[PDB]
Amino acid sequence: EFQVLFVLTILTLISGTIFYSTVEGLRPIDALYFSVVTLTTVGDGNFSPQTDFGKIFTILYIFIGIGLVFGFIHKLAVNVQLPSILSNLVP
Amino acid sequence: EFQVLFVLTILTLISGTIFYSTVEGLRPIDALYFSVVTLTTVGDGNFSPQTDFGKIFTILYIFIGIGLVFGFIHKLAVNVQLPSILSNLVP
Amino acid sequence: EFQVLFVLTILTLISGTIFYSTVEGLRPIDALYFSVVTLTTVGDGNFSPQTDFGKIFTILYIFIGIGLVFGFIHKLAVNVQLPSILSNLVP
Amino acid sequence: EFQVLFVLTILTLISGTIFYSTVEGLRPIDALYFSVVTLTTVGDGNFSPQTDFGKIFTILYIFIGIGLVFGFIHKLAVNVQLPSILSNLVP
Ligand SMILES: [Cs+]
Ligand code: NA
Ligand code: NA
Structure with a gap:
């Protein structure tokens, strides 16, 4: 589950990285950064597709990727750090 | 359900596209882009209504449209790609 | 419920409007706009408190107001437009 | 619960404050502000890591911190102000 969501999130971010570095001409790290802040809804105050x-890609990317990214963040927190932290809480 | 949320989301975005291209003078694609990033909470780091x-419209638009847009994103991920991906996962 | 969340949301936005127009010197409508996009997480790509x-106020404002604003958006969509639209859906 | 989420949120914000003031050279208050608006997804329309x-840190920070911050906001609203307000509602 967490493994599949992890993989699915990675592929989605790879696709965004390739798209923005190619069509929008961003350096790969900047393309990845933009993809991440866009799908997590944080946004970027400097760059917007030109x-x-x-x-158009960004519009479709948001609709298709937001769900997956948050599900991953959801399981990542609820199934990977909840217990890890909740562990020591046990005297 | 997904079909109605799809339609409802489209009409909401059409309304925003018409509003911003007219009152704020954006090119239609830019008006649609702004409407999408606003309702998904991604935001835009370049444009804000002038x-x-x-x-005022943006304030009301956000309150009325955020709920619908996320419900659509919700069903779109949970009822359209969850199984599709979860399908192959079946050996 | 929806009435109380409505009132509670209004008071929170009034407080933000007064704060930003006074301390940050924004025109009241701009102060209200900033308060709304901040609490809904949309954000503004032009203005940040100077x-x-x-x-400091914005940090506290976000933590205290995000919960309330989304609960209102939640009930507003689930208890005010869900049926309204879902109504006609009934042949 | 609320106490642990409170503490966990504080440590996460302290880490971001130290990181951005050091690597990105922000004044501590600006580093804290950036950390808060990033993890709550509000974002900042002026600053992006240079x-x-x-x-890279911001990408990882978002993925690891969004879950915790919203859980805290969740319990803070549902377990600390829900009753407090809901209290007086009782005639
Ligand atoms: Cs945002
Ligand atoms: Na957001
Ligand atoms: Na933003």
Whole structure:
């Protein structure tokens, strides 16, 4: 579960990284950064896609990727750190 | 369900597209982009409504549209891609 | 319920409107706009508090107001438009 | 519970404050502000990490911290202000 969501999240971010570095000309790390802050809804106050292709892709990317990214964040917190921390809480 | 949420989301985005292209003077694609990033809470780091009418509309738009947009994203992920991916997971 | 959340949301936004117009010097409508996009997490790509008092207030404001604002958005969609739309869906 | 989430949220914000003031050179209050708006997804329309180290840290920081911060906001609203307000509601 967490493993599949992990993999699925990675592929989604790879796709965004490739798209923005190619169509929007960002350095790969910047493309990955943009993909991450966009899908987590944090957003970026400096960059917004400048091409129409980039704007359309971003719209579709958000709708398809937000669900997956938060499910991963959900399981990551509830199934990977909840107990880990909740562990020591046990005297 | 997913079909109705799909339609309802489309109409909401059409309304935003028309509003921002008219009152804020954005190109239609930019108006649609702004509507999408606003309702998904991603936001835009470049554009903010410049007119008071645009600011008031945006406030109301957010309150009325956030719920619908996320419900759609919710069902879209839980009822359209959960199984699709979860399908192959079956050996 | 929806009425109390409505009132509670209004008071929270009034407080933000007064704070930002006074300490950050925004026009009241801009102060209200900032308060709304901050508590809904949409954010603004143009304005960020410039004073330390404004930064500290914003931090506390977010933590205390996000919960209330989304609960309101939650009930507003689930208890005010779900049926309204779901109504006609009935042949 | 609320006490542990409170503590856990504080440590996460302290880590971000130290990181951004050091690597990105922000004043401590600005580093704390950035950490808060990033983890709550509000975002900042002015600042984005300028170094690759800052971009990578921010990506990891978001994934690990969003879950905790919202759980805290969740319990804070549902277990600390729900009754407090809901209290007087009792005639
Ligand atoms: Cs945002
Ligand atoms: Na958000
Ligand atoms: Na934002």
